[PDB]
mmCIF file of C-alpha atoms and ligand atoms in Angstrom:
data_model
loop_
_atom_site.group_PDB
_atom_site.id
_atom_site.type_symbol
_atom_site.label_atom_id
_atom_site.label_comp_id
_atom_site.label_asym_id
_atom_site.label_seq_id
_atom_site.Cartn_x
_atom_site.Cartn_y
_atom_site.Cartn_z
ATOM 1 C CA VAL A 1 -10.563 -16.594 -8.838
ATOM 2 C CA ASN A 2 -11.005 -13.431 -6.755
ATOM 3 C CA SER A 3 -13.281 -10.384 -6.772
ATOM 4 C CA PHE A 4 -10.776 -7.756 -7.960
ATOM 5 C CA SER A 5 -12.454 -6.236 -11.022
ATOM 6 C CA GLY A 6 -11.158 -4.222 -13.956
ATOM 7 C CA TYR A 7 -7.449 -4.634 -13.225
ATOM 8 C CA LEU A 8 -4.765 -4.555 -15.915
ATOM 9 C CA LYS A 9 -2.408 -7.535 -15.599
ATOM 10 C CA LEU A 10 1.259 -6.506 -15.505
ATOM 11 C CA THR A 11 2.928 -9.817 -14.584
ATOM 12 C CA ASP A 12 2.058 -13.285 -13.338
ATOM 13 C CA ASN A 13 1.165 -11.862 -9.912
ATOM 14 C CA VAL A 14 0.949 -8.033 -10.181
ATOM 15 C CA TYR A 15 -2.205 -6.205 -11.318
ATOM 16 C CA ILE A 16 -2.909 -2.451 -11.537
ATOM 17 C CA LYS A 17 -5.970 -0.181 -11.711
ATOM 18 C CA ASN A 18 -6.737 3.554 -11.664
ATOM 19 C CA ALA A 19 -8.675 3.712 -8.404
ATOM 20 C CA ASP A 20 -8.663 5.379 -5.007
ATOM 21 C CA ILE A 21 -7.500 2.597 -2.664
ATOM 22 C CA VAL A 22 -10.098 3.794 -0.138
ATOM 23 C CA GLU A 23 -13.039 3.437 -2.530
ATOM 24 C CA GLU A 24 -11.586 0.187 -3.829
ATOM 25 C CA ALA A 25 -11.308 -1.231 -0.306
ATOM 26 C CA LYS A 26 -14.896 -0.193 0.462
ATOM 27 C CA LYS A 27 -16.105 -2.089 -2.621
ATOM 28 C CA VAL A 28 -13.964 -5.231 -2.426
ATOM 29 C CA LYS A 29 -13.527 -5.709 1.346
ATOM 30 C CA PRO A 30 -10.234 -7.551 0.722
ATOM 31 C CA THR A 31 -8.580 -9.820 3.244
ATOM 32 C CA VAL A 32 -5.663 -7.356 3.388
ATOM 33 C CA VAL A 33 -5.473 -3.665 2.525
ATOM 34 C CA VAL A 34 -2.016 -2.105 2.721
ATOM 35 C CA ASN A 35 -1.604 1.290 4.361
ATOM 36 C CA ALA A 36 1.288 3.558 3.364
ATOM 37 C CA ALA A 37 2.225 4.090 7.006
ATOM 38 C CA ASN A 38 4.889 6.054 8.845
ATOM 39 C CA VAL A 39 6.803 4.747 11.868
ATOM 40 C CA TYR A 40 4.486 6.487 14.386
ATOM 41 C CA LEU A 41 1.279 5.327 12.673
ATOM 42 C CA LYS A 42 0.207 8.985 12.512
ATOM 43 C CA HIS A 43 -2.356 8.786 9.710
ATOM 44 C CA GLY A 44 -2.542 12.437 8.740
ATOM 45 C CA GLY A 45 -2.693 12.542 4.948
ATOM 46 C CA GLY A 46 -1.982 10.561 1.816
ATOM 47 C CA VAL A 47 -3.201 6.977 1.716
ATOM 48 C CA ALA A 48 -3.012 6.794 5.507
ATOM 49 C CA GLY A 49 -5.023 9.924 6.234
ATOM 50 C CA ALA A 50 -7.624 8.880 3.666
ATOM 51 C CA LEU A 51 -7.974 5.289 4.930
ATOM 52 C CA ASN A 52 -8.163 6.539 8.501
ATOM 53 C CA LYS A 53 -10.834 9.102 7.598
ATOM 54 C CA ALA A 54 -12.903 6.318 6.015
ATOM 55 C CA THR A 55 -12.738 4.419 9.350
ATOM 56 C CA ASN A 56 -14.083 7.461 11.238
ATOM 57 C CA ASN A 57 -10.687 7.693 13.055
ATOM 58 C CA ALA A 58 -10.969 4.139 14.456
ATOM 59 C CA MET A 59 -7.743 3.218 12.659
ATOM 60 C CA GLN A 60 -5.944 6.057 14.468
ATOM 61 C CA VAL A 61 -7.361 5.070 17.871
ATOM 62 C CA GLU A 62 -6.227 1.470 17.377
ATOM 63 C CA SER A 63 -2.845 2.647 16.099
ATOM 64 C CA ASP A 64 -2.228 4.901 19.103
ATOM 65 C CA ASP A 65 -2.781 1.936 21.420
ATOM 66 C CA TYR A 66 -0.421 -0.159 19.269
ATOM 67 C CA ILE A 67 2.356 2.451 19.517
ATOM 68 C CA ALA A 68 1.834 2.959 23.251
ATOM 69 C CA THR A 69 2.374 -0.782 23.744
ATOM 70 C CA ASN A 70 5.031 -1.568 21.135
ATOM 71 C CA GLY A 71 6.808 1.641 20.155
ATOM 72 C CA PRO A 72 7.412 2.846 16.605
ATOM 73 C CA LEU A 73 7.813 0.626 13.589
ATOM 74 C CA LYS A 74 11.045 0.443 11.611
ATOM 75 C CA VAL A 75 11.366 2.049 8.195
ATOM 76 C CA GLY A 76 10.903 -0.954 5.922
ATOM 77 C CA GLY A 77 8.796 -2.703 8.568
ATOM 78 C CA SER A 78 5.131 -3.419 9.099
ATOM 79 C CA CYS A 79 2.432 -4.493 11.487
ATOM 80 C CA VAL A 80 -0.950 -6.161 11.006
ATOM 81 C CA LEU A 81 -3.910 -4.364 12.566
ATOM 82 C CA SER A 82 -7.654 -4.377 11.969
ATOM 83 C CA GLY A 83 -9.049 -3.453 8.583
ATOM 84 C CA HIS A 84 -12.086 -1.926 10.333
ATOM 85 C CA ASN A 85 -14.910 -1.350 7.813
ATOM 86 C CA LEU A 86 -12.518 -1.489 4.832
ATOM 87 C CA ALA A 87 -10.934 -4.967 4.932
ATOM 88 C CA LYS A 88 -10.398 -7.882 7.280
ATOM 89 C CA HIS A 89 -6.856 -6.709 8.078
ATOM 90 C CA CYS A 90 -4.744 -3.646 7.414
ATOM 91 C CA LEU A 91 -1.050 -4.253 6.791
ATOM 92 C CA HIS A 92 0.630 -0.986 7.816
ATOM 93 C CA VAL A 93 3.880 -0.853 5.812
ATOM 94 C CA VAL A 94 6.504 1.878 6.214
ATOM 95 C CA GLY A 95 8.262 2.746 2.986
ATOM 96 C CA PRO A 96 11.119 5.241 3.117
ATOM 97 C CA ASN A 97 10.264 8.916 3.004
ATOM 98 C CA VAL A 98 12.625 10.271 0.346
ATOM 99 C CA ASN A 99 11.894 13.884 1.309
ATOM 100 C CA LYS A 100 13.819 13.192 4.539
ATOM 101 C CA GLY A 101 16.656 11.327 2.834
ATOM 102 C CA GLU A 102 15.694 7.848 4.014
ATOM 103 C CA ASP A 103 17.470 5.052 2.160
ATOM 104 C CA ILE A 104 15.451 4.182 -0.931
ATOM 105 C CA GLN A 105 17.010 0.714 -0.743
ATOM 106 C CA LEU A 106 14.616 0.240 2.175
ATOM 107 C CA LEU A 107 11.794 0.234 -0.385
ATOM 108 C CA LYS A 108 12.602 -3.386 -1.235
ATOM 109 C CA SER A 109 12.484 -4.354 2.450
ATOM 110 C CA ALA A 110 9.117 -2.595 2.704
ATOM 111 C CA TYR A 111 7.660 -4.573 -0.207
ATOM 112 C CA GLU A 112 8.990 -7.851 1.257
ATOM 113 C CA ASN A 113 6.285 -7.552 3.925
ATOM 114 C CA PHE A 114 3.706 -8.208 1.199
ATOM 115 C CA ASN A 115 5.047 -11.760 0.744
ATOM 116 C CA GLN A 116 3.545 -12.760 4.104
ATOM 117 C CA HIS A 117 0.047 -12.429 2.576
ATOM 118 C CA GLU A 118 -1.313 -14.453 -0.321
ATOM 119 C CA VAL A 119 -3.451 -11.620 -1.770
ATOM 120 C CA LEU A 120 -3.356 -7.871 -1.059
ATOM 121 C CA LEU A 121 -4.855 -4.573 -2.171
ATOM 122 C CA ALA A 122 -2.062 -2.015 -2.025
ATOM 123 C CA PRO A 123 -0.856 1.454 -3.023
ATOM 124 C CA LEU A 124 2.551 2.271 -4.457
ATOM 125 C CA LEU A 125 4.786 2.458 -1.399
ATOM 126 C CA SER A 126 6.893 5.612 -1.010
ATOM 127 C CA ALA A 127 4.986 7.293 -3.869
ATOM 128 C CA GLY A 128 2.903 10.430 -3.511
ATOM 129 C CA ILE A 129 3.631 12.470 -0.397
ATOM 130 C CA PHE A 130 6.487 10.100 0.561
ATOM 131 C CA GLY A 131 8.525 11.629 -2.269
ATOM 132 C CA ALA A 132 9.858 8.657 -4.260
ATOM 133 C CA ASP A 133 9.526 8.060 -8.001
ATOM 134 C CA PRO A 134 6.315 6.029 -8.553
ATOM 135 C CA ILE A 135 7.753 4.317 -11.643
ATOM 136 C CA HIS A 136 10.602 3.032 -9.473
ATOM 137 C CA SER A 137 8.167 1.926 -6.765
ATOM 138 C CA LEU A 138 6.235 -0.164 -9.292
ATOM 139 C CA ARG A 139 9.482 -1.739 -10.532
ATOM 140 C CA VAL A 140 10.545 -2.677 -6.989
ATOM 141 C CA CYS A 141 7.071 -4.076 -6.336
ATOM 142 C CA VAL A 142 7.160 -6.314 -9.412
ATOM 143 C CA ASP A 143 10.711 -7.464 -8.636
ATOM 144 C CA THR A 144 10.060 -8.143 -4.918
ATOM 145 C CA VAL A 145 6.461 -9.219 -4.334
ATOM 146 C CA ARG A 146 5.723 -12.834 -5.247
ATOM 147 C CA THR A 147 2.206 -13.026 -3.807
ATOM 148 C CA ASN A 148 -0.840 -11.664 -5.642
ATOM 149 C CA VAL A 149 -0.927 -7.871 -5.414
ATOM 150 C CA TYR A 150 -3.645 -5.562 -6.731
ATOM 151 C CA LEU A 151 -2.255 -2.034 -6.987
ATOM 152 C CA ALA A 152 -4.697 0.875 -6.807
ATOM 153 C CA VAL A 153 -3.338 4.112 -8.293
ATOM 154 C CA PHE A 154 -5.185 7.326 -7.450
ATOM 155 C CA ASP A 155 -4.086 9.674 -10.242
ATOM 156 C CA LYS A 156 -5.386 8.807 -13.713
ATOM 157 C CA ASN A 157 -2.455 10.601 -15.324
ATOM 158 C CA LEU A 158 0.004 8.652 -13.176
ATOM 159 C CA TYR A 159 -1.819 5.370 -13.770
ATOM 160 C CA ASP A 160 -1.587 5.768 -17.557
ATOM 161 C CA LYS A 161 2.147 6.551 -17.430
ATOM 162 C CA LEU A 162 2.856 3.559 -15.177
ATOM 163 C CA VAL A 163 1.126 1.267 -17.667
ATOM 164 C CA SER A 164 2.716 2.864 -20.726
ATOM 165 C CA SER A 165 6.343 2.605 -19.539
ATOM 166 C CA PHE A 166 6.251 -0.922 -18.142
ATOM 167 C CA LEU A 167 7.419 -3.517 -20.688
HETATM 168 O O1 LIG B 1 -1.771 7.873 -7.529
HETATM 169 C C1 LIG B 1 -1.276 8.741 -6.848
HETATM 170 O O2 LIG B 1 -1.433 10.064 -7.142
HETATM 171 C C2 LIG B 1 -0.794 10.861 -6.148
HETATM 172 C C3 LIG B 1 0.025 9.861 -5.321
HETATM 173 N N1 LIG B 1 -0.460 8.563 -5.755
HETATM 174 C C4 LIG B 1 -0.086 7.267 -5.210
HETATM 175 C C5 LIG B 1 -0.221 7.235 -3.661
HETATM 176 N N2 LIG B 1 -1.553 7.669 -3.189
HETATM 177 C C6 LIG B 1 -2.717 6.943 -3.327
HETATM 178 N N3 LIG B 1 -2.705 5.753 -3.987
HETATM 179 C C7 LIG B 1 -3.856 5.063 -4.118
HETATM 180 N N4 LIG B 1 -5.071 5.398 -3.659
HETATM 181 C C8 LIG B 1 -5.043 6.592 -2.987
HETATM 182 N N5 LIG B 1 -6.121 7.179 -2.433
HETATM 183 C C9 LIG B 1 -5.786 8.348 -1.843
HETATM 184 C C10 LIG B 1 -6.635 9.245 -1.180
HETATM 185 C C11 LIG B 1 -6.000 10.380 -0.676
HETATM 186 F F1 LIG B 1 -6.745 11.292 -0.042
HETATM 187 C C12 LIG B 1 -4.628 10.625 -0.787
HETATM 188 C C13 LIG B 1 -3.828 9.726 -1.482
HETATM 189 C C14 LIG B 1 -4.384 8.562 -2.033
HETATM 190 C C15 LIG B 1 -3.907 7.423 -2.777
HETATM 191 CL CL1 LIG B 2 -0.117 10.180 -1.469
#
């Protein structure tokens, strides 16, 4: 039993809810919140800009130190950093940006990072401002993630279509 409330069960391990991941993280304080990161951990907009704003820019400060030490992430890769006031940990995961022609096959590699964590709150990787089809992102998630994932979807319209087209 866990504290994730009001989710619609899609599969054995995947659950979905119309919610802003930021507000959902603030309420649940999950062990792991997933950020829809880019390789530079520049959290300007989308999930990343919104999470970072909710941390009062502390996520960005921590991220800049991470990049200065380690260099950029890989597309499809991830790193674990602090969850600040939102979660214990933040798993920064880089899905491909389709608007720049990055290989959508890397979306599966991106979701594989979730399997290193038993339970996660997460957005749809590569959806929204990253330019991929959110229906496809959900399909890859369900077919790749084996650990327990709670997907927060911001747009009510999008949430209802993702549910409706699933089975
Ligand atoms: O649902 C969706 O509609 C448009 C894209 N998208 C899926 C990807 N985005 C999100 N996913 C989940 N929570 C979010 N909170 C946010 C707060 C923001 F300021 C910006 C973006 C999000 C967001
Ligand atoms: Cl977005």
